[PDB]
Amino acid sequence: LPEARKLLGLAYPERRRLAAAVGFLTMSSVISMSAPFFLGKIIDVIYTNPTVDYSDNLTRLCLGLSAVFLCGAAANAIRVYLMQTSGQRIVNRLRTSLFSSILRQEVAFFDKTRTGELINRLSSDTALLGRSVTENLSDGLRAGAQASVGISMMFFVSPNLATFVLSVVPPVSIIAVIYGRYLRKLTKVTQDSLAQATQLAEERIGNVRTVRAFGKEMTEIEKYASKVDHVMQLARKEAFARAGFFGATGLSGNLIVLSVLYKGGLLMGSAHMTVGELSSFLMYAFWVGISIGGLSSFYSELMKGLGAGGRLWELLEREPKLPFNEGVILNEKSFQGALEFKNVHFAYPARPEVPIFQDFSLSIPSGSVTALVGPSGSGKSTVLSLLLRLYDPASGTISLDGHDIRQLNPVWLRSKIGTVSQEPILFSCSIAENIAYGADDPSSVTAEEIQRVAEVANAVAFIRNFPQGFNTVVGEKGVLLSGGQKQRIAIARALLKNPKILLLDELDAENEYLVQEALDRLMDGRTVLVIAHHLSTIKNANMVAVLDQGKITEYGKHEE
Amino acid sequence: LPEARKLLGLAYPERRRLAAAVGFLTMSSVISMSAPFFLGKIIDVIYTNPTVDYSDNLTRLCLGLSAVFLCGAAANAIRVYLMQTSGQRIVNRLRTSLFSSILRQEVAFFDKTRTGELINRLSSDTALLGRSVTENLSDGLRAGAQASVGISMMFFVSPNLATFVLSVVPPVSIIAVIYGRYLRKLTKVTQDSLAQATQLAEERIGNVRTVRAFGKEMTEIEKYASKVDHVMQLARKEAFARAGFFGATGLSGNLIVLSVLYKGGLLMGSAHMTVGELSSFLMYAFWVGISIGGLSSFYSELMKGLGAGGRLWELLEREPKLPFNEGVILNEKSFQGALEFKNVHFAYPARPEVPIFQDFSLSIPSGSVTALVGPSGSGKSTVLSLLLRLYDPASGTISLDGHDIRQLNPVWLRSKIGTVSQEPILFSCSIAENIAYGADDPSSVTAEEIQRVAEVANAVAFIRNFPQGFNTVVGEKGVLLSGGQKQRIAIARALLKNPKILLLDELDAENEYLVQEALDRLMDGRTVLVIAHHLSTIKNANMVAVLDQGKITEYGKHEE
Numbered sequence A, B: 001l002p003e004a005r006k007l008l009g010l011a012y013p014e015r016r017r018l019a020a021a022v023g024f025l026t027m028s029s030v031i032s033m034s035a036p037f038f039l040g041k042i043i044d045v046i047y048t049n050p051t052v053d054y055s056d057n058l059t060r061l062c063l064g065l066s067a068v069f070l071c072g073a074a075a076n077a078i079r080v081y082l083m084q085t086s087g088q089r090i091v092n093r094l095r096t097s098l099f100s101s102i103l104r105q106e107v108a109f110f111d112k113t114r115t116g117e118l119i120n121r122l123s124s125d126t127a128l129l130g131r132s133v134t135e136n137l138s139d140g141l142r143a144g145a146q147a148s149v150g151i152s153m154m155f156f157v158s159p160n161l162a163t164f165v166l167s168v169v170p171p172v173s174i175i176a177v178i179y180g181r182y183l184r185k186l187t188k189v190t191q192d193s194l195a196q197a198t199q200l201a202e203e204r205i206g207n208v209r210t211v212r213a214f215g216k217e218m219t220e221i222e223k224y225a226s227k228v229d230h231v232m233q234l235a236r237k238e239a240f241a242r243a244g245f246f247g248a249t250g251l252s253g254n255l256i257v258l259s260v261l262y263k264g265g266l267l268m269g270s271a272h273m274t275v276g277e278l279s280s281f282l283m284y285a286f287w288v289g290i291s292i293g294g295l296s297s298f299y300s301e302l303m304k305g306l307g308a309g310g311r312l313w314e315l316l317e318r319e320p321k322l323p324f325n326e327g328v329i330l331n332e333k334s335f336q337g338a339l340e341f342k343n344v345h346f347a348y349p350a351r352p353e354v355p356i357f358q359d360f361s362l363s364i365p366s367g368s369v370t371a372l373v374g375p376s377g378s379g380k381s382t383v384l385s386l387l388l389r390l391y392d393p394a395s396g397t398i399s400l401d402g403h404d405i406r407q408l409n410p411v412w413l414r415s416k417i418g419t420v421s422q423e424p425i426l427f428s429c430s431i432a433e434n435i436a437y438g439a440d441d442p443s444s445v446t447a448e449e450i451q452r453v454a455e456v457a458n459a460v461a462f463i464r465n466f467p468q469g470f471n472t473v474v475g476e477k478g479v480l481l482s483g484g485q486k487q488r489i490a491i492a493r494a495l496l497k498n499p500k501i502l503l504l505d506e507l508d509a510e511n512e513y514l515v516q517e518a519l520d521r522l523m524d525g526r527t528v529l530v531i532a533h534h535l536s537t538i539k540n541a542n543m544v545a546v547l548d549q550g551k552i553t554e555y556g557k558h559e560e
């Protein structure tokens, strides 16, 4: 019921179509359940006491039923369409709403949650939930209605035969359900054993380096063989129980029909059934049988849809631990570009036991180039993650012109901070689209504006030399670029963004000249914090900071 | 046909069961196809020209048909069992054979191929292939046989009615197949569009750090919304074509049955059909209809099984690029333990553009401790990978006592080399099983032997202090151990292996004493090559080698 209110509100914008489709479902079902009654009359017209006017009755009964079938098909076709489209619209709203919720979450969420799981929840689970309040809902509704009308029509056609069926079917159904539960137990045992053999395989294949190192390849093969030989043993037992069940179920189905023909055939003489009447009863009995299986499948899909529901309401109602677009914007006169780290303590969410910063204090002055030095893996790149507020420190404060960056709007704070990595991330778009990404509105930037920043970044030359120019598709699924080329597109993107604060992370001879010339134009008049591996940039940097054991161990000029 | 020879040979060990199951499939199908003929006789006994002895004929006809149904169910049950078990045995042989092929492959194969893909090929594709030569094969065989007998029985029951059905069904079927192809086109267009919207989502979710850095969260949401709004547009068009098809197909099905009742009903007077005869024809026509759908589904599963086949024959017929158990074994007098690297050039298979070793030359003398020094990420751990022959160098040679390690048996070469990592890999087994892993036969080692190596490795104390002692389950799915505890179990495993060559890769105060005391006992009388981060082990090492830019830049004693 509380989860049903969520599913009712989800189907609510399509209430108009779902009500129309249900109206068309009613018509299609009414025409469909009338068919065995009229088919029974056709059979009796030909085979009860055929008169000379039997062909005249048959012709109007068949032409009449043809028109009803054409009407029923049109009503069913309209139902399927309206039900499918309603689901499509619900899924569409779920997809846009889920993706919006996902992108609003903090980086820490993505650090723990797999991309594939988010994509599967956005593609599979969204489609399943939409289907459950539409396609599945109408399927179970139709099935529930046809069973009801069917049982009612069996008692109408022959109360005696219907009473007999209803005295045989429940005991047999109870026995079959008990057998069905025992069969499910043997299936779980086999599937749990299969999982165990697969877990062993996954562990040894995953750690094949250790298996090889000890020469245990043949030892693991024999170990795995024993686990899958056990699966086979359990599967044979499950196969025997399934064969005995299917045989008993099959025989029951055949003998029950044989009983109805016998019992019905011997009914004398006012409770007697004509061959057409017996055809009505059998058709209605077969419709109840189908409808029972329909309700069974409906429950199976309703449970799958509820399982998908829980996975989606989990992300749709999720609140990010770090603000998305909440905070204050500092004035043009209030913002100078001076940044300060004060006793910062931080460990990544994936590895909280491994500290990255242990009492990290650093003062980056406005308009001055600060060089960050240290060994590989010391945690220099983590400084840029905390400055852009991708994570909040466990202890300590990061301030901009005396104002805590936690009080400010992170979207605005990031618009004033730019970054040029050693290996920049470029999307599978055109060179122009990737450059336009810097602007607050990449749809507002003109072709002349993209060309201007490309000339300053010394990128215009190689870009024009490409067959499609600025429309040359880069990224992973695009044209392979050199480190220097990728960096100059990253400089062009940063130049168009025009940040006050710039963060640099540091190659042949030809590339490194045009890149450093463009980096010079980019660095000028900006607060620069560069993580260096080259002694050339440390030498001309305003101040140098050494990071050792998560703390600024040394501070001052290159010579000092 | 060439792939069919592979599927024939796969079913060949179970030829005896599959022939028995086919024999039982023949009986079950023969009894099943006889049922509409005898049911038609039951109907006529009651409703053609009912005599006073109609109940006597009906009783023996129903009791007779009951016995035949009981026989048919028993024959079908036996078939299902024999078919399922044959498949299970084929899948079992495929699983043991595929896992054997996987573990025999070189490390480079696992570096490029995902673990999950190997597991899915070992669980899903193995089960599918087995099903295709058994369960599916019998399903398509039964379906093919029932259609054949069905059509033959329709012509037997009424040649006139059968000719009419066969003059209506093919034109309608041709039209439906043309409609079915157009419907598949609109479905592909929608599913290709869905893939595109998902690819965009996957790329932006995967690179959420870049999306946030430029404040393009709202920009990507709007970009994705446009892609899924297009999916919805294409899905509505597909929904309209599907509704029009289902309506036309449904109507055809109903009107064809209505035509057969009409045509058949008006058949006069020697070609006339009794109500039972019409029931036979309709039942046989419904059996052909089911059988046509059965052959359709059989082809669908045969193609899926052939697709699975290709994925498996790819790994089963695969030859490892590096020898598995091929080579020569050096004599006890010929082997001293002296190792030499000569102008080794190597780059990992995943990143061949990034060189790790660039003219690497190192001489490790027998019984002497050699310390390897260098910065983090210089490629010191790669030395152990090439020494254990997990990869072969692109240029250069690795020799043992003047003999090229490429000529020797890698399984034997690895039995003489042991390794103790900083973070050792322990399987989710007991402490004793993990220690026993060192021995050439972990089933041969006694409890006294595991206790002896545990006492020497200073591990016996904490192991006995555990609730289950040596039977304490460690690894990922087990009891959490400290770095020192894990290292002492790794020393116990190495002590039991008893290698001539030992490779060490380098922590509080209490752990580091008992670990270094155990490492001392382990190092003694062995050729040791240690990658150090601690100045204590470099100081007492026989010779020190410095690795810078993939080459031994410095060589000699700690003081020198």
Ligand SMILES: CC(C)CCC[C@@H](C)[C@H]1CC[C@H]2[C@@H]3CC=C4C[C@@H](OC(=O)CCC(=O)O)CC[C@]4(C)[C@H]3CC[C@]12C
Residues within 6 Å of the ligand: A240, A243, A244, A245, A247, A248, A251, B070, B073, B074, B077, B078, B081, B082, B085
């Ligand atoms: C009266 C109703 C409720 C049941 C009517 C069907 C029975 C007569 C069927 C159902 C399951 C059948 C059994 C399914 C499986 C087997 C295993 C089969 O054994 C083998 O093929 C030997 C090799 C092996 O088991 O691997 C022998 C027949 C038997 C007992 C079958 C005998 C006939 C049974 C009991």
Ligand SMILES: CC(C)CCC[C@@H](C)[C@H]1CC[C@H]2[C@@H]3CC=C4C[C@@H](OC(=O)CCC(=O)O)CC[C@]4(C)[C@H]3CC[C@]12C
Residues within 6 Å of the ligand: A070, A073, A074, A077, A078, A081, A082, A085, B240, B243, B244, B245, B247, B248, B251
């Ligand atoms: C004679 C045989 C071959 C076909 C018998 C069935 C037809 C009478 C059916 C099949 C598909 C039906 C159509 C399926 C979908 C629609 C869309 C439906 O439009 C809406 O519900 C408007 C909103 C929207 O399209 O989103 C109007 C009826 C119509 C044309 C249906 C009219 C009746 C059709 C043509």
Ligand SMILES: Nc1ncnc2c1ncn2[C@@H]1O[C@H](COP(=O)(O)OP(=O)(O)NP(=O)(O)O)[C@@H](O)[C@H]1O
Residues within 6 Å of the ligand: A111, A348, A349, A350, A351, A356, A375, A376, A377, A378, A379, A380, A381, A382, A383
């Ligand atoms: N998101 C993360 N979650 C967990 N651990 C991480 C994460 N990012 C980085 N690390 C680890 O933290 C270590 C140091 O942090 P990092 O900021 O990457 O260093 P660095 O100074 O940039 N080193 P380098 O790779 O030479 O440039 C890395 O080597 C990783 O093992």
Ligand SMILES: Nc1ncnc2c1ncn2[C@@H]1O[C@H](COP(=O)(O)OP(=O)(O)NP(=O)(O)O)[C@@H](O)[C@H]1O
Residues within 6 Å of the ligand: B111, B348, B349, B350, B351, B356, B375, B376, B377, B378, B379, B380, B381, B382, B383
């Ligand atoms: N299987 C592999 N495929 C591709 N690249 C790899 C592989 N293994 C390691 N690398 C890379 O090679 C680099 C150096 O090799 P490696 O042998 O790991 O170094 P190291 O001296 O052990 N450094 P460290 O991590 O401090 O101990 C690593 O930092 C990885 O980026």
